[PDB]
Design a protein around this ligand. Structure first.
Ligand code: ZN
Ligand code: ZN
Ligand code: ZN
Ligand code: ZN
Lengths: 141, 689, 689, 141
């Protein structure tokens, strides 16, 4: 993976490049260097995360490290909060065309989740220019 | 004739209506036509036609020709009451400005009314108009401001006072507290939004120089863990747009930094009655977290005074301090690390500069986020809790060692009593970053410094290169010798053989010649390039002679204050009063806000004897008392009233001197026998430490 | 005649008024006199005179003689509307009950009205009366309750339904949510306060036994640091009065614990519509923190169902858990200690009893406050975060090892399917404290246990010694052989030679004779002392035969639950459903509350195939599925709807069995090809673990 | 100080018994075993605290240990809060006749402080049967 653009940036392309499937691929967390559980690999692909290359090696993130560092980023790098309507006015774009991730798990918000944000007047948060929301899994009490 | 078939008025048509309605002694048709066309937005769009379609001088003549009486002046009052609600929702929902830009006309017509200044519009007419103007689109506001920027200072003054007394009246008329806020008062909010348009008309209409901008401040890279996260999200390439800025700043393209000399002094836009009633704890909340009907006045910082702006910055740093508390707790919980919620700074009293240099440099590399923690200073040997008193002591100590003549960092000017960056200081970029960090740390930790800088230093900190105008404060003697050249009527080439080469005296005494141009010795100074030579001369000393020293100084200041709204809230002239304090020692305001403990009361016999002594103190002894009790001899922003001093009883009468808890501005006062004994011990206490 | 000079009425005076106003065909004077005397409190005080001065049977005859029509029944409706506001503020401000206790009369007169039950009083009349009654002083309420306690069950039922439908009507009539609470609704609050009077009339009017009380539970001593603080404040001698109790409990002198058989079942006092709308997060706040116009329904726990009471206890334990989080953070901050916000419990799977015994015993001595921390269980070797799944696994494991026959702690009864304390268990007081702690820990940490106990155990836990009535559930066979003696018509001395000496069979098989009296072999059983022998026989087995085993068991349960409102909120019959769960597996309610993740939805093809499989499951396979997914085979309080299960997608089709995250009731379901494959893998998954 | 009742329970009596004054007496904190500062001795006497005897030796408390353990007691042993009016109804006594200490520094509340509690509708807190309030020194922001 010496070539920067050639190396896969997503889990399906990485699996195809290594001639393996997401059902059997073996990955390590970029933070804790520990092998990812199978459900963690499935979450990684479901959360549309990017493969991280350290010293020419493909890495992923485990669930606990992802949530920990997302919490740290929310705590230390929070900028401001906006209403979904104000977000659309600022970008002149529908929320469905904006990449908004869950503040906790970094899962890209579905259009239904953004609609719920609009309906309940829940605010979207900005963390170093990244717009974050709350997903259903992390919204439940 | 009623004139019942005319919808648009004209500069001469109102004249003919007035003249035919004058000798007939019945103005009522004129009242009716004015109340008809002025209360209709579409009618006012086509009225008084010719980047605007309304003749500016035409309406001014019409208003002065027609407002001299007492009847029709009421019609304009009532027409504004009807027109405004039909023009506010028209802008809010219909989006009528996008269809045609001629809709801005009616706002020029209304604002040309002289009686808006009068106190009969503050009840119903002016508040409704301001609600409509605050709903103008950004592009519409851009043209209104640019049109308003061409006015004279007196015209801008009338515009500013118009919205100022509306804000003042509504603050006086209504009762605002923590229950009923000012942020949800739409009349004051709208008048503040309208005042912002005049404020930027003041900025873009004055002396604006948008070119002499310093290099973009080096943005500190986030922690390695944060960099890893952005890679996982696929956002490592794209970067954050930057700090919060006013949208009107972008649309106009001119910033208040670029404004050197506004038509009206900026301090005139501060509405004092609003500041005494604002609650900055919740104002800051509406600044960061958008609320449906709550408006942050930090979005319009020109209206806040230094005290209010200081509070809003304090809450921002405080909130960021707490976020570092929660992160360390999570690190101890999840990662099993040690609880370190402090920017721990172990230094030696005899080597404070070197110890703070190695400690703060090491932090700026490994964990640059530690600078956002609450500062904890502890000296070697002496062990104790740092509640703020040690940090105040440390901040005082570093300033003396930094600005001491022997270190060679700064050259002191006796006449101006100001320090300037020493160009002859080499291999000291680490120390210049240290004093930049210390200044940022003092702001972050709410400690004022005894720092004497020319205003050009604070201008350069915000990214404006010093110009010839700034040379007066820094080097007045050389500034005088340079403007004397500027207005020399005779031939400058003949009288004075000065060229584009300058001689600079080193600290040792050996002069080295510097060339402002490529070959300044060859090229002489003539009247044609006389202006350019002064520009290059001023650009060298203020910007290019100290570029490396100031680059490190600016870098260290940035790594502490980059995430703060400091650049947003404060102009460079307001930075000096923020970093330093007031030099005014109003000990009366100190008396009013002083609290008592240990059995003392405002009516205690020793307390009255104490205040009698300190009010008879000289200025030197007042400074000694302030430094001894609060750790600094300078008053905080505002005055000594903000220094909420506490005088606490400390045992019975004795020979022991009074003590002080500098961290909390607490004076520990024994119950001495008499006033003479109290003065002798108090004078002995403050003249020793 | 209008009868305009009479203020007090009489049992026979209303009769003469009615008879003279009957044949004259004009009842209007009767309407006027009733509306005059009933709307006046002082008039009603002297009306229908003779621990009360009003003849009880007199007014009942008067009401039934006079309410048979349709006109005067409206007068009583309107008289109550006027009398109540003049009698509520009269009690609240004037303090009229202290002056004379005869003022309670009017409340008996009003509550004797049969039409109060009717639905024409729920709008205006009954709500106003309940506001007045809730302002009665404690002494006044004591006599009303004692007077009401003499009624029959049917009479008490009418009284209870009267305030129940008022609560039901106001909940239906109004819209209550998190914005507009029920706690600030004074009509419902007053009707709840009035229902409490009927509730205690139900208690003190039934079978009350206040004598057979167990020894006061040993109060755990506070931490050594707390003991030092009380010495500094000079409060080490005086001790805290104890847990919160209802003031009406003290005034009446009878507790719901003392009530064995109330006239009305306690479950009838639960107002279901109120429970579905109550918010226990803020109800608990008003329970602990007094608020001016907010009323806690936890102060009247009889009205809450098991689910609502479980929530209020959960919030109390949760709040106490958080207070332990803040204390450890302060200990790490101030004292520089290690962050330990958990009741860490390292145990071995093969030695779970011994490892938990030494760990929990050591805590109960050194730091008894650690039991108030959130429980963290980790097994040796297997390393992972305990989010609740390991604690649920630990709780299940200890119950099996504790109640296993070989350990000798408990004897299992096949017929009742219940465990009883084994009297032949010696040198096991440490283990009995362990199972008491585990039961308290399961309550504290919101984990249900698979524990089968007779109701007498839960009665003794709250401090009531078992009686002969409790012997039926514990030992039905011996209970049958003892009541058969009770109703033996013949001479018990002649027919059966049983005496005051009993024979107990040991676990080994060797019987040892126990003497209930000093010399029970000498004294035979006669008809005179036949009752006493059964009382001593039942007192021995339930209380004295296992006194040491239960003392340790009760002590361990107390050190975890002493500060909880558990004793306040729950009756002993409600403890079993709190410690254990429902045995009912309503998988339909499980379907409604189930959530989906990983791309699954309620309409996913595999999701519908999944619910089709599990609804066709047998009871045994339903229990296997519950234990596999949630860690326990028992439903929580309420039902499986409270078990907010989550079915999350786990990759594509495969041969891998579905997995479960027991901590969060998450089922990890691969997207299998068909319904047959899904069942085979799901059955393989739950029948293996 | 073998005799329990004979040994002084207050700072002035302890000073008189040792033939010293509060101006010179040397005391150690019962918790940290560290010598009390002079201002700490004056606070101890002003806060009406009781001398604690450990192994037959008189001890006092320092300011930081007192505040720390008062905070711990408030966190872990808090029972419930009452309004001052409800307090008077419960005890049938004026607040001036009730010993209410500051929740933070354990200084007995003055009648003026209890009056302020009544006026601002500030609640009194119960901590193991000890009724606590907020003193002026600890009420300031
Ligand atoms: Zn990891
Ligand atoms: Zn999420
Ligand atoms: Zn101490
Ligand atoms: Zn205090």
């Amino acid at each position: 993976f010496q070539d920067p653009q050639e190396r896969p940036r997503k889990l399906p392309q990485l699996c195809t490049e290594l001639q393996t499937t997401i059902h059997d691929i073996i990955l390590e967390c970029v933070y804790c260097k520990q092998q990812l559980l199978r459900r963690e690999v499935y979450d990684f692909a479901f959360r549309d995360l990017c493969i991280v290359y350290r010293d020419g090696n493909p890495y992923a993130v485990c669930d606990k490290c992802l949530k920990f560092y997302s919490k740290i980023s929310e705590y230390r790098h929070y900028s401001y909060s906006l209403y979904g309507t104000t977000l659309e006015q600022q970008y002149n774009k529908p929320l469905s065309d904006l990449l908004i991730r869950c503040i906790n798990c970094q899962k890209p918000l579905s259009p239904e989740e953004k609609q719920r944000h609009l309906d309940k007047k829940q605010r979207f948060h900005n963390i170093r220019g990244r717009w974050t929301g709350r997903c259903m899994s992390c919204s439940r009490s | 004739i009623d004139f019942k078939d005319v919808t648009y008025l004209t500069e001469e048509k109102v004249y003919e209506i007035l003249e035919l309605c004058r000798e007939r002694e019945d103005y009522s048709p004129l009242i009716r036509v004015i109340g008809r066309v002025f209360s209709s937005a579409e009618a006012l769009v086509q009225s008084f036609r010719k980047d605007v379609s309304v003749d500016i001088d035409a309406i001014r003549r019409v208003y002065t020709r027609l407002l001299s009486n007492e009847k029709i002046e009421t019609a304009f009052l009532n027409a504004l009451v009807y027109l405004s609600p039909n023009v506010e929702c028209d802008l809010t929902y219909h989006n009528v400005y996008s269809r045609d830009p001629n809709y801005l006309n009616l706002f020029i017509i209304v604002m040309e009314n002289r009686n808006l200044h009068s106190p009969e519009y503050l009840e119903m007419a002016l508040p409704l108009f301001c609600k409509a103007m605050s709903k103008l689109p950004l592009a519409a506001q851009g043209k209104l401001i640019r049109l308003w920027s061409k006015y004279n200072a007196d015209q801008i003054r009338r515009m500013m006072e118009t919205f100022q007394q509306l804000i003042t009246y509504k603050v006086i008329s209504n009762e605002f507290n923590s229950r009923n806020l000012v942020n949800d008062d739409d009349a004051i909010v709208a008048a503040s939004k309208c005042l912002k348009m005049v404020y930027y008309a003041n900025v873009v209409g004055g002396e604006v120089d948008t070119n002499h901008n310093e290099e973009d401040d080096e943005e500190p890279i986030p922690e390695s863990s944060e960099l890893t996260l952005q890679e996982l999200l696929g956002e490592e390439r794209r970067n954050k747009k930057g700090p919060r800025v006013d949208p009107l700043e972008t649309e106009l393209g001119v910033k208040t930094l670029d404004c050197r000399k506004p038509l009206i002094p900026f301090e005139e836009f501060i509405n004092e009655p609003l500041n005494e009633v604002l609650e900055m704890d919740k104002d800051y909340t509406f600044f960061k977290v958008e609320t449906e009907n709550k408006f942050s006045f930090m979005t319009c910082p020109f209206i806040l005074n230094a005290v209010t702006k200081n509070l809003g910055l304090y809450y921002d740093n405080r909130i960021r301090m707490y976020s570092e508390r929660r992160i360390t707790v999570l690190y101890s919980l999840v990662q099993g690390q040690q609880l370190n919620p402090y920017l721990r700074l172990k230094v030696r009293r005899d080597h404070i500069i070197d110890d703070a240099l190695v400690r703060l440099e090491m932090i700026a590399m490994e964990n640059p986020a530690d600078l956002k923690k609450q500062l904890y200073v502890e000296f070697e040997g002496e062990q104790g809790v740092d509640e703020g008193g040690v940090s105040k002591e440390f901040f005082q100590l570093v300033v003396e060692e930094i600005f001491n003549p022997d270190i060679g960092m700064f050259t002191y000017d006796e006449s101006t009593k100001l320090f300037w960056f020493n160009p002859s200081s080499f291999e000291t970029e680490g120390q210049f970053t240290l004093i930049g960090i210390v200044l940022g740390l003092a702001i972050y930790n709410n400690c004022i410094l005894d720092v004497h800088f020319p205003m050009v230093v604070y201008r350069k900190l915000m990214g404006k290169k010093g110009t010839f105008r700034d040379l007066g404060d820094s080097h007045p003697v050389l500034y005088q010798s340079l403007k004397d050249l500027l207005e020399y009527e005779g031939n400058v080439e003949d009288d004075m053989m000065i060229t584009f080469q300058i001689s600079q005296t080193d600290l040792f005494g050996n002069p080295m010649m510097y060339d402002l141009k490529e070959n300044g010795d060859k090229i002489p100074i003539t009247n044609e390039n006389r202006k350019e030579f002064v520009n290059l001369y001023s650009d060298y000393i203020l910007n290019k002679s100290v570029e490396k020293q100031f680059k490190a100084f600016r870098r260290g200041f940035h790594m502490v204050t980059n995430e703060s709204p400091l650049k947003y809230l404060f102009r460079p002239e307001e930075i000096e009063l923020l970093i330093c304090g007031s030099r005014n020692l109003d000990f009366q305001a100190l008396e009013e806000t002083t609290e008592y403990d240990g059995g003392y009361t405002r009516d205690s016999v020793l307390i009255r004897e104490f205040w009698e002594i300190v009010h008879s103190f000289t200025d030197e002894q007042k400074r000694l008392f302030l430094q001894f009790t609060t750790g600094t001899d300078r008053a905080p922003v505002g005055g000594l009233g903000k220094l909420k001093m506490i005088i606490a009883k400390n045992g019975p009468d004795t020979e022991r001197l009074p003590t002080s808890h500098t961290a909390f501005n607490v004076l520990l006062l024994p119950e001495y026998s008499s006033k003479e004994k109290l003065k002798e011990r108090l004078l002995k206490a403050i003249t020793y430490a």
